[PDB]
């Protein structure tokens, strides 16, 4: 009856809506079997202390699923890792909704953890989705590399491997590196004249102000920048017509909470009509066995879902991260912010407003400028040569 579904959240205000949400959930799929309970504690300061609490409080109440959001005030320096670890033992699925840096994506260091917020690696899918219909194919890639740097390019290649086409070189430089202008000549001396960029805010600003003297900006020098490069302090540095970017929901955790609890309620309503459900233990103390009803839960959480929530239609992929995310293409036009259309996901729908490419042109210049490069190479042999 008391199918506890905890949710470690932000300050009390952001946790307030849960007790109102559970009543709606308790009423929609109502019966004398799904009388849920809610136990929650905010993101405590430090990390080890909260890791104690999640066993001191949450599984000490014998919970069945965990929901986690981002800390309200600080940055992503101390995102909750131990939740994926403390719940990592019993193999219970854990649902995140806002924390996003693409490290959590692979189900190898975090076993089982699905997110309703898509990591930045999907920009590569979006980048492909529009570079197909833009009359250019050859592309130059620039990115840092801590963990995400390899991920974006590797996904871009997993996409550009079935078309027998290949991109150009990728320039991997350590995060937080200045005076990196040496590689700009090496990239410039090549036919392709479109650039892919992705880095942290400070790194983007450094490699950004380290390019004006060198004439990387102008017509035929279209730049590719994601929300990481645009959102932050690097806003007041853009050229005349760079490609902005922006997501739909952002800080709208209420709708995410509603959709997540609806999906979880449907899944647990199916689950209650299943085989034996192991009673969750007293918690961390004493017992360290294996919760046999762990992967069974994610066996259906990963699949299906298909709920109709406020955020839209959620569809998780084979490895957690959802699919079919609506998206608002942004554009910077001389220190201004205007959109170009709506990327609903897997369908390209830009509007017919005014767009400006770098250099002020409004056209589709070739991915590689001019022509007549090809180099002959033979070997002295026979009357042929």
């Amino acid at each position, epitope marked *: 009856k008391i199918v506890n579904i905890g949710a470690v959240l932000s300050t009390r205000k952001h946790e307030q809506m849960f007790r109102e949400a559970v009543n709606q959930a308790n*009423k*929609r*799929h*109502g019966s004398w079997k799904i009388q849920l309970n809610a136990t929650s504690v905010t993101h405590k300061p430090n990390a080890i202390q909260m890791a104690l609490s999640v066993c001191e409080d949450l599984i000490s109440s014998q919970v069945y699923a965990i929901l986690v959001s981002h800390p309200p005030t600080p940055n992503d320096h101390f995102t909750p890792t131990p939740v994926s670890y403390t719940a990592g033992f019993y193999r219970i699925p854990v649902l995140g909704l806002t924390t996003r840096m693409s490290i959590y994506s692979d189900k190898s260091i975090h076993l089982s953890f699905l997110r309703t917020v898509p990591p930045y690696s999907h920009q590569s899918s979006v980048w492909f989705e529009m570079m197909r219909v833009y009359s250019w194919n050859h592309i130059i890639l620039l990115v840092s590399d801590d963990h995400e740097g390899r991920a974006a390019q590797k996904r871009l290649e997993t996409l550009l491997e079935e078309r027998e086409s290949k991109a150009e070189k990728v320039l991997q430089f350590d995060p937080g590196t200045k005076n990196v202008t040496a590689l700009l000549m090496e990239a410039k001396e090549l036919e392709a004249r479109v650039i892919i960029l992705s880095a942290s805010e400070d790194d983007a600003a450094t490699v950004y102000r380290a390019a004006a003297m060198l004439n990387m900006t102008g017509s035929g020098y279209v730049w590719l920048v994601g929300e990481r490069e645009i959102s932050g302090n690097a806003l007041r540095y853009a050229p005349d017509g760079i490609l902005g970017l922006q997501l739909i929901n952002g800080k709208n955790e209420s709708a995410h909470i509603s959709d997540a609890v609806g999906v979880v309620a*449907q899944a647990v*309503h*199916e689950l209650l009509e299943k085989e034996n459900i192991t009673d969750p233990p007293r918690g961390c103390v004493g017992n360290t066995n294996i919760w046999k009803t762990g992967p069974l839960f994610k066996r259906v959480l990963m699949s*299906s879902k*298909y*709920a*109709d929530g406020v955020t839209g*239609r959620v569809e998780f992929n084979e490895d957690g991260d959802r699919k079919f995310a609506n998206y608002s293409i942004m554009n910077l036009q001389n220190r201004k912010l205007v959109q170009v259309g709506i990327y609903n996901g897997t369908h390209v729908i830009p509007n017919d407003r005014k767009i400006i490419w770098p250099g002020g042109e409004t056209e589709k210049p070739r991915g590689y400028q001019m022509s007549t490069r090809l180099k002959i190479v033979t070997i002295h042999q026979e009357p042929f040569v």
Partner: antibody
Amino acid sequence: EVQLVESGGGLVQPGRSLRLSCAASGFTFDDYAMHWVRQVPGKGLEWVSGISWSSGSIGYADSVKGRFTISRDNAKNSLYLQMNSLRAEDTALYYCAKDRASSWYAYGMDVWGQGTLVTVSS
Amino acid sequence: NFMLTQPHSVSESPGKTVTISCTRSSGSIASNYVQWYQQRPGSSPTTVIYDDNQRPSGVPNRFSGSIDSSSNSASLIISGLKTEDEADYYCQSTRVFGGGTKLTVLG
């Protein structure tokens, strides 16, 4: 547009099985589960069954055990709640219906089909 | 289980408000979403009010919803007019339908 087309309403001798087929048109079928409510001459309706958006989840009300079964296919856009061993109480107005979501535990109802007459008597 | 409560039939002239109440006997009325359904004679049934206050897309307002428990009851209120307000009203809360109400125009 949203419309649950149903036909094949007629008279069947009690005890014999029946084969009903309700088709759809317009909206996308995948994102919605299909309900099965019916009225009866002289009284109101009662919720009976709901088939999941693809398969697996099937729910029944208090008196829907045994011959009162549901089935559906998501290939040729048909709904196949078929009846076997019918009795006199089964003579009523039958509607094939669809939930507002891919599940049916909420009993959310919209687009109330067209109606079919299954007759079971002497 | 539980049984709802709907009036057998009500009559109202055009230009006057009409009320149709669905009263739940066992359990809290608000504990389950009562859903008002309208079924015109000789036509496919339609929805009017669900989750105790909601109009479907395309419904020209004019249909409210009362969920005040009071004596463990709920009701549907329609603004005063009898243009096409002659049908059968069905209330459903959870797996159970009411007796039904028939509204007639005054001639």
